[PDB]
Amino acid sequence: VDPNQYYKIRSQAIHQLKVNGEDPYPHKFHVDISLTDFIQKYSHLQPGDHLTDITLKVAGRIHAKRASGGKLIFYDLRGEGVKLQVMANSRNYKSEEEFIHINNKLRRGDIIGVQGNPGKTKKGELSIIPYEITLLSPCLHMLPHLHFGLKDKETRYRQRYLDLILNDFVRQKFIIRSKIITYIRSFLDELGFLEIETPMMNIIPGGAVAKPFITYHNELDMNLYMRIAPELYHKMLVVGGIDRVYEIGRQFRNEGIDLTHNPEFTTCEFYMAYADYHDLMEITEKMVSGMVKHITGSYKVTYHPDGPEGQAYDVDFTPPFRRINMVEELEKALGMKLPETNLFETEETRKILDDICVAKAVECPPPRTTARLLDKLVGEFLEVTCINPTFICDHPQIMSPLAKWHRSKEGLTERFELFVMKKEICNAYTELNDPMRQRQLFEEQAKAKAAGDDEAMFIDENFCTALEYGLPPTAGWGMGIDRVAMFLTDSNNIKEVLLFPAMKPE
Amino acid sequence: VDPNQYYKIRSQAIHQLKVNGEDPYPHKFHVDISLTDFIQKYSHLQPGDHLTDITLKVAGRIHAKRASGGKLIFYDLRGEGVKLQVMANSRNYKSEEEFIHINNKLRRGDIIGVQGNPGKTKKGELSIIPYEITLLSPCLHMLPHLKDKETRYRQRYLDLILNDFVRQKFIIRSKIITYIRSFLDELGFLEIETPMMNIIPGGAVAKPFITYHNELDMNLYMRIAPELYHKMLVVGGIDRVYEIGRQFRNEGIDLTHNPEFTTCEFYMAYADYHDLMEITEKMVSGMVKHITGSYKVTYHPDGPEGQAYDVDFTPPFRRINMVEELEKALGMKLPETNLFETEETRKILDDICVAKAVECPPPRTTARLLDKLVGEFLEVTCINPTFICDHPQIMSPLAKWHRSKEGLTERFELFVMKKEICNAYTELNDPMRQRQLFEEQAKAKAAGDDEAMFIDENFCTALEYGLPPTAGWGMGIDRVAMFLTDSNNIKEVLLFPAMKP
Amino acid sequence: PMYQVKPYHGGGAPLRVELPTCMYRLPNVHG
Numbered sequence A: 001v002d003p004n005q006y007y008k009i010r011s012q013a014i015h016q017l018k019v020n021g022e023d024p025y026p027h028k029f030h031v032d033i034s035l036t037d038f039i040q041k042y043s044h045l046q047p048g049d050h051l052t053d054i055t056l057k058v059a060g061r062i063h064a065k066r067a068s069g070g071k072l073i074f075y076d077l078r079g080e081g082v083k084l085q086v087m088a089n090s091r092n093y094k095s096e097e098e099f100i101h102i103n104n105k106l107r108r109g110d111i112i113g114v115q116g117n118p119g120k121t122k123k124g125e126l127s128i129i130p131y132e133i134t135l136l137s138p139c140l141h142m143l144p145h146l147h148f149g150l151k152d153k154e155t156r157y158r159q160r161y162l163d164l165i166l167n168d169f170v171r172q173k174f175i176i177r178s179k180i181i182t183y184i185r186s187f188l189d190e191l192g193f194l195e196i197e198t199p200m201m202n203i204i205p206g207g208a209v210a211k212p213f214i215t216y217h218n219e220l221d222m223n224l225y226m227r228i229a230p231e232l233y234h235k236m237l238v239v240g241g242i243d244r245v246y247e248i249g250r251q252f253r254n255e256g257i258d259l260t261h262n263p264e265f266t267t268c269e270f271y272m273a274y275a276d277y278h279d280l281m282e283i284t285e286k287m288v289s290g291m292v293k294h295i296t297g298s299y300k301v302t303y304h305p306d307g308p309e310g311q312a313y314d315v316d317f318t319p320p321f322r323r324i325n326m327v328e329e330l331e332k333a334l335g336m337k338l339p340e341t342n343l344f345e346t347e348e349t350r351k352i353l354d355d356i357c358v359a360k361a362v363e364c365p366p367p368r369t370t371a372r373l374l375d376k377l378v379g380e381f382l383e384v385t386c387i388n389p390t391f392i393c394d395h396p397q398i399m400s401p402l403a404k405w406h407r408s409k410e411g412l413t414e415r416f417e418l419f420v421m422k423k424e425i426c427n428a429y430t431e432l433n434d435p436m437r438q439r440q441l442f443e444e445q446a447k448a449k450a451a452g453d454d455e456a457m458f459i460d461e462n463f464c465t466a467l468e469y470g471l472p473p474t475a476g477w478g479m480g481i482d483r484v485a486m487f488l489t490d491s492n493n494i495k496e497v498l499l500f501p502a503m504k505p506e
Numbered sequence B: 001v002d003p004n005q006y007y008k009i010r011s012q013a014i015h016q017l018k019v020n021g022e023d024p025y026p027h028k029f030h031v032d033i034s035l036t037d038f039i040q041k042y043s044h045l046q047p048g049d050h051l052t053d054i055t056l057k058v059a060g061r062i063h064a065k066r067a068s069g070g071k072l073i074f075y076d077l078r079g080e081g082v083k084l085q086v087m088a089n090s091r092n093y094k095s096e097e098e099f100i101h102i103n104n105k106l107r108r109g110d111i112i113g114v115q116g117n118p119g120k121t122k123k124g125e126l127s128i129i130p131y132e133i134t135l136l137s138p139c140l141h142m143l144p145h146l147k148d149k150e151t152r153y154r155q156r157y158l159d160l161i162l163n164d165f166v167r168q169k170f171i172i173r174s175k176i177i178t179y180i181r182s183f184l185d186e187l188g189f190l191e192i193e194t195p196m197m198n199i200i201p202g203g204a205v206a207k208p209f210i211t212y213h214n215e216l217d218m219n220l221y222m223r224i225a226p227e228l229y230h231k232m233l234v235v236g237g238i239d240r241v242y243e244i245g246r247q248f249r250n251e252g253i254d255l256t257h258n259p260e261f262t263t264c265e266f267y268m269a270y271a272d273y274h275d276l277m278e279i280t281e282k283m284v285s286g287m288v289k290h291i292t293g294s295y296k297v298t299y300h301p302d303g304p305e306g307q308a309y310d311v312d313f314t315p316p317f318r319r320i321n322m323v324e325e326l327e328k329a330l331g332m333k334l335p336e337t338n339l340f341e342t343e344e345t346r347k348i349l350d351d352i353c354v355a356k357a358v359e360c361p362p363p364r365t366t367a368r369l370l371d372k373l374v375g376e377f378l379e380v381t382c383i384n385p386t387f388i389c390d391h392p393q394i395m396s397p398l399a400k401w402h403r404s405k406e407g408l409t410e411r412f413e414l415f416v417m418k419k420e421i422c423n424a425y426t427e428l429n430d431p432m433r434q435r436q437l438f439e440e441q442a443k444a445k446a447a448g449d450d451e452a453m454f455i456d457e458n459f460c461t462a463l464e465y466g467l468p469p470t471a472g473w474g475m476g477i478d479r480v481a482m483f484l485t486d487s488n489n490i491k492e493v494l495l496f497p498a499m500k501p
Numbered sequence C: 001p002m003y004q005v006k007p008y009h010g011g012g013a014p015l016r017v018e019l020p021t022c023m024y025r026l027p028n029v030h031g
């Protein structure tokens, strides 16, 4: 049968139902009990059982309609990740006439309401035997018969509702995603953090390195930018005396789409007064391992980066996490000494790293800055070794415009990134609170922005002023929720953990 | 002294601390105890008492530096909206030279860490007596000796440093959001995130922000409501969803409007707006009782020296039907409800709007006229929480038609203090009717209603796959926040409100 | 570790003030 024909015919049929006052879209059906509770309550029933003294109203979507007579029709009711059989017998329905009528009405895909008695077939399938079946909302389209589920990603991501009907695991991915977010909130709330909201539109975007979205405000005749990170606002709040803050919210980047990249994504940021990044490493260990254990039942999870048609990695979130220092470990991987860390701002250094990238075949598209070449090298040699949760620590100041200088190692900063499965999930640092250094760094950033780099960031003077009023010694932290969602739902693709991911149109 | 010179002098002094290596911005100071816990632990001390076996590190900002002289100084150390006296006398310090150095170093506004002993004064004031004081972060400016609203909203950190009540408002805001999440979570709702940039903006009546996605050569609109996505998820089989998230409007920035604001939207399968009325009563009433202690709340819509309104959130909330109570308030009969799409009716409502001096800017559609009349005669009677129910379909393009009253919809708005805080309705699940109403909306958008809706054909398709009987609901968190913090300005409940530079 | 700060709320969670009963039960997804 042809799906368009099916649609035309079915639309006609429902229209007919409308003109007959047969009410194909009722207003209210009173559900007595969830399918889940119904199953949990009446599973103990024996084959052949039929409770005459219990009558219940359940609802759901028809997955299948099959006959075993002209007086016997079985419907497969689905809901809540679960199934219940509707055993519609003529003898138990209110009329023969109405039984015939309702069975002529219903097609696979319909939302129905069922009022009936709990029972179980001779085979032993728990069922509900209907006194009355009510059409709650008809499905006008033909739902696909599929052998391997809905696999076509275009269909799955554009029509998420289809994915959710036809595929059982999708639901659980988004449940897990919610569990993550809620767990984090509970963690932080219990540590005395105040959940806050900061602006998503600013006049100058800051907090990370990214190409922003630009929109126009009509009444004010100025451009606003969509935010890339709430960082600077939080630090201002800490100056104002709120010692512990967090926000779980959306961030925006005008980039492209890949497996780890959507234009809008969810992050959690928190800022904590009188903490340094060692404290943040300890809290991060507790939060991530706790999260994984609470949600999945264990510290060990399996990941298939290349899909189920590929290798499985065993990821161990058992604390403590491996720690590596970026520069030393990069040297160790390269088998060569890199220049002294106080010499990273020089051209000699840039030239050395350039040569090494060329010789090790690591691409760095222009501009081939020291910071970028470093990043590409780290990505090639260190990040790939990070299967289990690994802290990469002590980044150069040239990669970290807002991180406080390292108290031992000149040219470095008190910063870390959490890597899991070769990808970054956290970024944190002891915050820079010296207004002068912060302004200098902003100035170098603005100089790099003058040469043409659209990701390198602006000078926020309000933020520098705020620093001048006295930002306490503070440590800050950011986490990519979507990525954590990926690794905990065994998704190799960010489109899997976004309900409605961005798609280049058709 | 002069602030711009104070700043230069301080800058120089701190710079000198840097070049001398006395470390004005130390990396790490280990606080042993919060000021709040300190106070809770040692408030019970007798005056003149002085626990010497206990040494503790605390931290905070300096609000006042006063010296008795010359071996003694008192510091007013604040944090967490509490205060602690630092009683610094020379004989208790680590050394008299270091005492002198450290006091000569400090100024008011400075973040400092204090290591010392708990003890009261004879005067009775709970204090810490320092073995050592460390400068954590210098304040380079003159702090004000703060009421000016523009100055508070533009420098929120000053506001939070100087004014104690702001912090409390934001704590209340947070408590409201947290309560809502607990409430829906416990009711079996899945907390979800839907896109904040769309191709077609839908869900509400509003004028969107437009922005451009470079790598797609495509314009995207910032969202005005999550509604259509939620309904699509209910289609998907997720029976209960909610989202507490941001929303955007390209509009006027004012006393009650910000270009970005926060709503909670939830959708519930197999519910109708009656069910949603019960749920709303329970949620709001309980929320208020939980946050404030009582169902009773006093509010000042204009000034603290203005008319005070006393509001009773005790359920059940009053209910009024829109058309009926408009007929009561107009002293006249209105057209039969199945006549509301006629220009006869539009003309009648225009004549009634003129006759009772109600201003309706163009375009004077039946809906805008109706809304203006409801605003004038009905909303002003809504001091206590009041459900205004059974809106006409012309005002409610996504609402399901009333099951008795033709021309009406199964909808309510919740009003407190003459302002809308909730909007909810039995959801329209008929794809044909919805398409028709979208087409009517598109006609009204071609003839120049600027906030009028577009045509989501995808949403319509979803409806064709079948949306179960569902009821939906929306709440303006910012307004609830205003009402529970006695704020008549929306800037009072947004940490960094939009300002018109 | 880091000094104790008391949770701004609890000690969650509320709706021990109010849970309506007009609609069938679904269980808290977090439980």
Ligand SMILES: Nc1ncnc2c1ncn2[C@@H]1O[C@H](COP(=O)(O)CP(=O)(O)OP(=O)(O)O)[C@@H](O)[C@H]1O
Pocket (backbone or CB within 6 Å): A253, A255, A260, A261, A262, A263, A264, A265, A375, A379, A424, A425, A426, A479, A480, A482, A483, A494
């Ligand atoms: N479009 C997006 N989608 C999901 N997460 C994003 C994102 N853009 C940024 N992020 C988050 O912010 C962080 C930014 O990472 P960066 O190191 O600045 C560039 P990357 O491409 O993620 O790393 P890489 O280029 O070394 O592979 C990531 O950890 C990620 O969690």
Ligand SMILES: N[C@@H](CCCC[NH3+])C(=O)O
Pocket (backbone or CB within 6 Å): A207, A208, A228, A229, A230, A231, A269, A427, A428, A429, A431, A476, A477, A478, A479
């Ligand atoms: N805003 C940062 C995360 C916080 C880093 C610590 N202050 C980012 O986008 O990576």
Ligand SMILES: N[C@@H](CCCC[NH3+])C(=O)O
Pocket (backbone or CB within 6 Å): B203, B204, B205, B224, B225, B226, B227, B265, B398, B423, B424, B425, B472, B473, B474, B475
């Ligand atoms: N989107 C609506 C709230 C949802 C109403 C129920 N579907 C609004 O902006 O007010």
Ligand SMILES: [Mg+2]
Pocket (backbone or CB within 6 Å): A417, A424, A427
């Ligand atoms: Mg990174």
Ligand SMILES: [Mg+2]
Pocket (backbone or CB within 6 Å): B413, B420
């Ligand atoms: Mg309104």
